[PDB]
Amino acid sequence: PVLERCTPDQLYRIEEYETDQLWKVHCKEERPEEYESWREMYLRLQDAREQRLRVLTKN
């Protein structure tokens, strides 16, 4: 239940040390997993978002 209150990266850093529904909750909106888990989808779409913010935000 404490994991339910964790951000994606708080949850991720915990796992890098059975919870795909936490990742389903985190997961757009007009977005379904291809052949991956909810967890894998998130990390792929968050990477993309992160690169795109990176480019916009360099002043």
Add this chain to the structure above:
Amino acid sequence: PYSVLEPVLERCTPDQLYRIEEYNHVLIEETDQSWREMYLRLQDAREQRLRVL
């Protein structure tokens, strides 16, 4: 301009906002989140507790 970045930043998660903020530190007027720092003090409280489990 921040006015153009602003509504995209609003779709970011706290840790994603913070990472963008650590990427470009000029980002500020990001307060609409004393103040975007009570968050960081409280989250750090949570993080220490989580460490122990």
